[PDB]
JSON list of N, CA, C and O in Angstrom, two decimals:
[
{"chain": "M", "resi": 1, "resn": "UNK", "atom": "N", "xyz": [18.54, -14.26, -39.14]},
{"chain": "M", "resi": 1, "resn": "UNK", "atom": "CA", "xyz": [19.57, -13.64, -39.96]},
{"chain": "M", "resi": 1, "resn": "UNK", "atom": "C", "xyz": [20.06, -14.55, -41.07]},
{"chain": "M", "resi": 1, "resn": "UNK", "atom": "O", "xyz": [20.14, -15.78, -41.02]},
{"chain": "M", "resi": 2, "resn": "UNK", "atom": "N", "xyz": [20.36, -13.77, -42.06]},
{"chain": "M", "resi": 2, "resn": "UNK", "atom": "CA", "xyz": [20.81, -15.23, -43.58]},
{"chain": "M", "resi": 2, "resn": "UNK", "atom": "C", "xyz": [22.33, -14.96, -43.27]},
{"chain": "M", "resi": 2, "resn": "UNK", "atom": "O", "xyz": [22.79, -14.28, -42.36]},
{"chain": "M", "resi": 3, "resn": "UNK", "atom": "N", "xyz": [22.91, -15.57, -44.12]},
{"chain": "M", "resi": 3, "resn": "UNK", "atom": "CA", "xyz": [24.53, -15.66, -44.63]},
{"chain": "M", "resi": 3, "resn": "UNK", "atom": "C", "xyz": [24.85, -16.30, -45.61]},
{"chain": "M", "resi": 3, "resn": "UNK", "atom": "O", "xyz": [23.88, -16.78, -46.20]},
{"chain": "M", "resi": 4, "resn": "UNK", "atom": "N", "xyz": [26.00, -16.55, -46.12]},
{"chain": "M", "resi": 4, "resn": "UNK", "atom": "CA", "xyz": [26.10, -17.03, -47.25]},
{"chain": "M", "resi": 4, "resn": "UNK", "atom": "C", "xyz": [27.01, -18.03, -46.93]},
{"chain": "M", "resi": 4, "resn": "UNK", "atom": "O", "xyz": [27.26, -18.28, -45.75]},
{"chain": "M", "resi": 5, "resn": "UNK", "atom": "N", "xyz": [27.76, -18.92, -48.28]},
{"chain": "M", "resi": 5, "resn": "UNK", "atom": "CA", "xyz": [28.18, -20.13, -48.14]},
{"chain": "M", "resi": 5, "resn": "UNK", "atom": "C", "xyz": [29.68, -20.15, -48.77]},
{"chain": "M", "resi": 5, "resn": "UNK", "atom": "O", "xyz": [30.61, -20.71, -48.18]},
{"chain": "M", "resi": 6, "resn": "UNK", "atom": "N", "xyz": [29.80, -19.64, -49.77]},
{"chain": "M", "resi": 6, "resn": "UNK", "atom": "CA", "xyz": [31.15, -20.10, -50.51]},
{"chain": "M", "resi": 6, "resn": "UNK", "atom": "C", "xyz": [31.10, -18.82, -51.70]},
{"chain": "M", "resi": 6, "resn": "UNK", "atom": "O", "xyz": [30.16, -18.42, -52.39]},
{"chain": "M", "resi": 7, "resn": "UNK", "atom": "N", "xyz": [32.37, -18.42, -51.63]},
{"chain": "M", "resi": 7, "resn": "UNK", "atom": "CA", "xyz": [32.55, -17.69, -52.78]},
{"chain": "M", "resi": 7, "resn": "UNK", "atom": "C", "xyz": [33.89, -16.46, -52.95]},
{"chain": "M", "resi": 7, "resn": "UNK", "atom": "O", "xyz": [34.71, -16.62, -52.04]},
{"chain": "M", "resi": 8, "resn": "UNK", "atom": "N", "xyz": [34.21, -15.47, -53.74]},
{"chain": "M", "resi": 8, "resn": "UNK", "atom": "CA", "xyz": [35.07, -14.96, -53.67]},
{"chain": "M", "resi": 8, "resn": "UNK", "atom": "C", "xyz": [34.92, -13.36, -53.59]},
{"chain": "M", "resi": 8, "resn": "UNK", "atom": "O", "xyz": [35.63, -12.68, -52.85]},
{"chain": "M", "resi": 9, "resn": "UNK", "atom": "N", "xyz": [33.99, -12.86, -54.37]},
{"chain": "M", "resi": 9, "resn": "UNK", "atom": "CA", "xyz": [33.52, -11.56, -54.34]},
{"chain": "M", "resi": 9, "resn": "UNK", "atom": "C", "xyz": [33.27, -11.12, -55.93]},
{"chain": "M", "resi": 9, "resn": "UNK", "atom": "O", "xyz": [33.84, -11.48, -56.96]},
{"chain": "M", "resi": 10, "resn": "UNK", "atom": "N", "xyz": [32.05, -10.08, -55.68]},
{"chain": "M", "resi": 10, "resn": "UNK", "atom": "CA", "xyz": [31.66, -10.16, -57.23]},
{"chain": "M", "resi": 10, "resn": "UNK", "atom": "C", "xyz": [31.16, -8.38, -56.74]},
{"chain": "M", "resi": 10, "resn": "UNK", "atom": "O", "xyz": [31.54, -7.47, -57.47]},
{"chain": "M", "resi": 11, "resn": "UNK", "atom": "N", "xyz": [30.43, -8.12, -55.67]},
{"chain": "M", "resi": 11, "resn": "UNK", "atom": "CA", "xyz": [29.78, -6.89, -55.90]},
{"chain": "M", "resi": 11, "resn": "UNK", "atom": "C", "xyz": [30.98, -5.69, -55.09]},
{"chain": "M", "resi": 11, "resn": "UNK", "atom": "O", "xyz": [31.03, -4.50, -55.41]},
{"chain": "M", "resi": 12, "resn": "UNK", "atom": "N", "xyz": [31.73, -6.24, -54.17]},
{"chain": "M", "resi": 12, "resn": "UNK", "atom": "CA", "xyz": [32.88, -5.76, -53.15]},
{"chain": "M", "resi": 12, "resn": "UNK", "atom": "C", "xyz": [32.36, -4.68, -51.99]},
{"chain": "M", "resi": 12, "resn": "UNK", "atom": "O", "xyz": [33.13, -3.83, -51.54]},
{"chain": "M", "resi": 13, "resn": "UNK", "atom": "N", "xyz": [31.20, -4.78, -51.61]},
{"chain": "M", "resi": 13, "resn": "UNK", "atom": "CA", "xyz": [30.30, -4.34, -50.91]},
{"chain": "M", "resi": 13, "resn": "UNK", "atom": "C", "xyz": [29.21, -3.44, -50.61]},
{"chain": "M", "resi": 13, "resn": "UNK", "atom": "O", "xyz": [29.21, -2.79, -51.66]},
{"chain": "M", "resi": 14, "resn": "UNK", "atom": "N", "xyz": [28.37, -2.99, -49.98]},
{"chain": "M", "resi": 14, "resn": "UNK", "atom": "CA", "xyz": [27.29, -1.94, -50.11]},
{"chain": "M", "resi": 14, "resn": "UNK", "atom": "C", "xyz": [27.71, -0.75, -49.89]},
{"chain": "M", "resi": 14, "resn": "UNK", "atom": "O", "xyz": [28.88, -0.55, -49.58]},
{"chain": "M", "resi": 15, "resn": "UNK", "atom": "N", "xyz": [26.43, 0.63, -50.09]},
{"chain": "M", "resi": 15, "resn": "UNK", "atom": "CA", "xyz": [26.38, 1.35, -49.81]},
{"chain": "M", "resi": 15, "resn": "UNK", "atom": "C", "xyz": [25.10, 2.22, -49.74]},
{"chain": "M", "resi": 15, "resn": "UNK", "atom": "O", "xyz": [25.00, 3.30, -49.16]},
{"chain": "M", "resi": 16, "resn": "UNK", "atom": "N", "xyz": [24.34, 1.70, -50.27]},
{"chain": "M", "resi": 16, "resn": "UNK", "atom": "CA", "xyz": [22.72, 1.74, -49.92]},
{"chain": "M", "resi": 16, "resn": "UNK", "atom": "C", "xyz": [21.69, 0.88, -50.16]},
{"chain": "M", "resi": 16, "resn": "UNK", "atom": "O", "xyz": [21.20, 0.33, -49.18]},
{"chain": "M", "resi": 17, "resn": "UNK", "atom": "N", "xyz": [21.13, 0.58, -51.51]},
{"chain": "M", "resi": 17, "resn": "UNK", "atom": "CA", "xyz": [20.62, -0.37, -51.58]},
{"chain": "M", "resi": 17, "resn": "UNK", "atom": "C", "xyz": [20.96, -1.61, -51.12]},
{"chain": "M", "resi": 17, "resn": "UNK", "atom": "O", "xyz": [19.96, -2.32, -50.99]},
{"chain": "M", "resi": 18, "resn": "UNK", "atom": "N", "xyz": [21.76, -2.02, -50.90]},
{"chain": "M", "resi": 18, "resn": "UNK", "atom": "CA", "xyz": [22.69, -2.93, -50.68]},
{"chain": "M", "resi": 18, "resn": "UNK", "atom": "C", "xyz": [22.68, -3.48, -49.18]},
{"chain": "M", "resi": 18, "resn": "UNK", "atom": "O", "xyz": [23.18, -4.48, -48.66]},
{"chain": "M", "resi": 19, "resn": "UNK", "atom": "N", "xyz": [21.65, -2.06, -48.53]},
{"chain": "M", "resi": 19, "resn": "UNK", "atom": "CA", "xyz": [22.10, -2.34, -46.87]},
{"chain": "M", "resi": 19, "resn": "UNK", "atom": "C", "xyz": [20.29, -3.28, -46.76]},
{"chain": "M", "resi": 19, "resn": "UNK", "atom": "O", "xyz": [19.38, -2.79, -46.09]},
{"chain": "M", "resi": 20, "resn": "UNK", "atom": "N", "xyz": [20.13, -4.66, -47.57]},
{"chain": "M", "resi": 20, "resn": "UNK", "atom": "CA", "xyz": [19.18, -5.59, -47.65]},
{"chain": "M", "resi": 20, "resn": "UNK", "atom": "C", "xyz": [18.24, -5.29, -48.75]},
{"chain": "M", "resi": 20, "resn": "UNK", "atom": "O", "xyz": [17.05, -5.48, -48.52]},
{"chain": "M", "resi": 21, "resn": "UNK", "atom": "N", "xyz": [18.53, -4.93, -49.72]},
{"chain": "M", "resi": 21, "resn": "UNK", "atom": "CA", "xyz": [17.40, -5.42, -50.94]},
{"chain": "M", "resi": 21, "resn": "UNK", "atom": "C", "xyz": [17.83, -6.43, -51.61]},
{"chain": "M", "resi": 21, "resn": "UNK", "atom": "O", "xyz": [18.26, -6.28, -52.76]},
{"chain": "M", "resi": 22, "resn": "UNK", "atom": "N", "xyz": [17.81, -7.22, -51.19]},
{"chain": "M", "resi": 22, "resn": "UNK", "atom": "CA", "xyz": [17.96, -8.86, -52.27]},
{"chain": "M", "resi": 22, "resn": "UNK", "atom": "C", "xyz": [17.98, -9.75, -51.72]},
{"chain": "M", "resi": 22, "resn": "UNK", "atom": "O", "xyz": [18.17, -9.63, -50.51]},
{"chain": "M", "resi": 23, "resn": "UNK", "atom": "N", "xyz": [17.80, -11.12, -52.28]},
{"chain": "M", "resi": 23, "resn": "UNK", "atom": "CA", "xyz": [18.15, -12.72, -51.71]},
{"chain": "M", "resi": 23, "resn": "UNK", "atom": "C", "xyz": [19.02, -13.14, -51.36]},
{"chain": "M", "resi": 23, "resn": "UNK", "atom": "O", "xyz": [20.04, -12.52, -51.66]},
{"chain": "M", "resi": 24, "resn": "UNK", "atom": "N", "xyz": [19.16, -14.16, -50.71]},
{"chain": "M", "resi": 24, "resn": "UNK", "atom": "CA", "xyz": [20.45, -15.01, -50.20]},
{"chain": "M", "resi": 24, "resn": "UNK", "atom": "C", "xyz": [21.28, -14.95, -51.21]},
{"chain": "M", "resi": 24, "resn": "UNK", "atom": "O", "xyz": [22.44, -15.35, -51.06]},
{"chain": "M", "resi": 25, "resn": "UNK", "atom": "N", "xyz": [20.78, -14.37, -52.60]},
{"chain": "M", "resi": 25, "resn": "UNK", "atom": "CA", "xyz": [22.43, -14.15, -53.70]},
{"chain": "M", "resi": 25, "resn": "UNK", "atom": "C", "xyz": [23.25, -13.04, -53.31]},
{"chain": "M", "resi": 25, "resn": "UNK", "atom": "O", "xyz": [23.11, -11.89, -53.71]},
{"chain": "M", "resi": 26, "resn": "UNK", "atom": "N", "xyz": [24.09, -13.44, -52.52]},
{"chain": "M", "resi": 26, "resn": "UNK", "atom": "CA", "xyz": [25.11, -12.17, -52.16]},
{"chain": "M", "resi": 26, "resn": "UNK", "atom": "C", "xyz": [26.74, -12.83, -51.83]},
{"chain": "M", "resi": 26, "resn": "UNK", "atom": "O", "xyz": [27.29, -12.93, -50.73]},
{"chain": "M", "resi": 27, "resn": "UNK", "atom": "N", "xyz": [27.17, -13.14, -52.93]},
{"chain": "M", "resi": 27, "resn": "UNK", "atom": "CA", "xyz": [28.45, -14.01, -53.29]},
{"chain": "M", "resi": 27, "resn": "UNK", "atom": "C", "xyz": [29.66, -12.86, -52.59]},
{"chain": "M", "resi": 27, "resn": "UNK", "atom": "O", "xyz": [30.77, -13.20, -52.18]},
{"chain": "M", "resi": 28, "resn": "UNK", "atom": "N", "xyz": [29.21, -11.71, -52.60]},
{"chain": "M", "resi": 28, "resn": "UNK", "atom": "CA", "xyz": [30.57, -10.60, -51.47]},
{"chain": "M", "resi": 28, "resn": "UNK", "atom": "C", "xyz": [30.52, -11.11, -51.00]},
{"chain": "M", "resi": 28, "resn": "UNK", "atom": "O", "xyz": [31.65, -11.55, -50.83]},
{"chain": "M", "resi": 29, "resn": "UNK", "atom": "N", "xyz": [29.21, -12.04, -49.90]},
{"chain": "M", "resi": 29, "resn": "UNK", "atom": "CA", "xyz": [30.58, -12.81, -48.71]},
{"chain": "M", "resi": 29, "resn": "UNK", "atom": "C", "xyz": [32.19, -13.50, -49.21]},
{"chain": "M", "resi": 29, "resn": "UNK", "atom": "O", "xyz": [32.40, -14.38, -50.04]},
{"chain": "M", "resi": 30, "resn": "UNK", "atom": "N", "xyz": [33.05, -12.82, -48.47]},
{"chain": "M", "resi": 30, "resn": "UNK", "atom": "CA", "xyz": [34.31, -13.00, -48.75]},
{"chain": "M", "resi": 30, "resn": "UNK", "atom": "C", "xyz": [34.60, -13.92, -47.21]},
{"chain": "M", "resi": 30, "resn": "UNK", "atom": "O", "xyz": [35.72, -14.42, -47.11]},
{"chain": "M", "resi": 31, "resn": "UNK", "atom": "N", "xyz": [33.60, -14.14, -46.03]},
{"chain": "M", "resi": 31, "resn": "UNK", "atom": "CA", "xyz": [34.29, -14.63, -45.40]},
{"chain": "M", "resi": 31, "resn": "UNK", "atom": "C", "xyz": [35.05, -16.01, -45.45]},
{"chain": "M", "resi": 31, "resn": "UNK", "atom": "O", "xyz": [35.53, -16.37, -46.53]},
{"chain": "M", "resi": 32, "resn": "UNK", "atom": "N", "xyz": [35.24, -17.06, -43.97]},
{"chain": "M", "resi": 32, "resn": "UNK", "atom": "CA", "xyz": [36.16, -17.78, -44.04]},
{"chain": "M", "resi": 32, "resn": "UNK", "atom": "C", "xyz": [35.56, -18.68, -42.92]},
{"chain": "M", "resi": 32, "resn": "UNK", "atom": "O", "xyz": [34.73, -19.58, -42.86]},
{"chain": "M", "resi": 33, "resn": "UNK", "atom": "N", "xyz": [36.44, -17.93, -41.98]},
{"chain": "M", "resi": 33, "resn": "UNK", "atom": "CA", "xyz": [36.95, -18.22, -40.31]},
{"chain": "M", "resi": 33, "resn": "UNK", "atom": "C", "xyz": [35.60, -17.77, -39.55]},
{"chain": "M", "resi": 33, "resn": "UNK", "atom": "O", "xyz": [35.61, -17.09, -38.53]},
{"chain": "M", "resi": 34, "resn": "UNK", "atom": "N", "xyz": [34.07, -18.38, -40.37]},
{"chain": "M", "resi": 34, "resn": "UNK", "atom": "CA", "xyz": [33.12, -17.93, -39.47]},
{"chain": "M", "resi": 34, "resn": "UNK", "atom": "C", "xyz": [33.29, -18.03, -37.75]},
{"chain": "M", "resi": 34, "resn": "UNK", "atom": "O", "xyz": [34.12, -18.71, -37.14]},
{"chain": "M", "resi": 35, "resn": "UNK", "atom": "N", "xyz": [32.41, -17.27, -37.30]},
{"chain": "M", "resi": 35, "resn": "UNK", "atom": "CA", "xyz": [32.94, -17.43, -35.27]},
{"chain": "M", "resi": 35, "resn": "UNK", "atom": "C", "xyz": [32.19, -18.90, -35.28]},
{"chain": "M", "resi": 35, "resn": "UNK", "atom": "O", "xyz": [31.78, -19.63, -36.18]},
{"chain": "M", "resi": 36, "resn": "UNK", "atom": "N", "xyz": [32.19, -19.02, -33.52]},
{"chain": "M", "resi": 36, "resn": "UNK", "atom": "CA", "xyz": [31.46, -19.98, -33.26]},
{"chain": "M", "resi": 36, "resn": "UNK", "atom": "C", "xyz": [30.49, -20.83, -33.52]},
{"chain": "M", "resi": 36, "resn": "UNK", "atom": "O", "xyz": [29.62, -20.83, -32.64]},
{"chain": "M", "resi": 37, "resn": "UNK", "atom": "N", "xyz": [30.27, -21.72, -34.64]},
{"chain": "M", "resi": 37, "resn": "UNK", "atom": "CA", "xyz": [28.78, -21.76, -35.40]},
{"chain": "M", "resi": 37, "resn": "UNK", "atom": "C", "xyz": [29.90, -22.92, -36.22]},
{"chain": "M", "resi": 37, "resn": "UNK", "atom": "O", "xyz": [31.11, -23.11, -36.35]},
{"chain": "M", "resi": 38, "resn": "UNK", "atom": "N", "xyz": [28.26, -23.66, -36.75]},
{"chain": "M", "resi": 38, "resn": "UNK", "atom": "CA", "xyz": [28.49, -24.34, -38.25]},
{"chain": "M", "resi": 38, "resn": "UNK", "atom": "C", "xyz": [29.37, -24.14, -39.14]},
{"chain": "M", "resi": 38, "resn": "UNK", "atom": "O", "xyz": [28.58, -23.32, -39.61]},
{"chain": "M", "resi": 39, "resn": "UNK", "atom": "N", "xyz": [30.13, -24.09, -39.74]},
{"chain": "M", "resi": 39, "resn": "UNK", "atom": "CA", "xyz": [31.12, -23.55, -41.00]},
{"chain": "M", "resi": 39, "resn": "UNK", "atom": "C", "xyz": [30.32, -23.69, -42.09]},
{"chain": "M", "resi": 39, "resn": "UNK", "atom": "O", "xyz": [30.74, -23.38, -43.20]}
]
């Protein structure tokens, strides 16, 4: 599974294409407080 690293939001999320056509460029991650794991 990928994820992303740092950022604020640019696309504000999917709705079809979106549900995996592209590269690790996906700056919507808005998260933070990843769970249990690496930060």
């Amino acid at each position: 599974g990928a994820m992303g690293s740092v950022d604020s939001a640019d696309a504000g999320g999917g709705s079809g294409w979106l549900t995996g056509w592209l590269p690790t460029w996906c700056p919507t991650s808005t998260s933070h407080l990843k769970e249990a794991e690496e930060k």
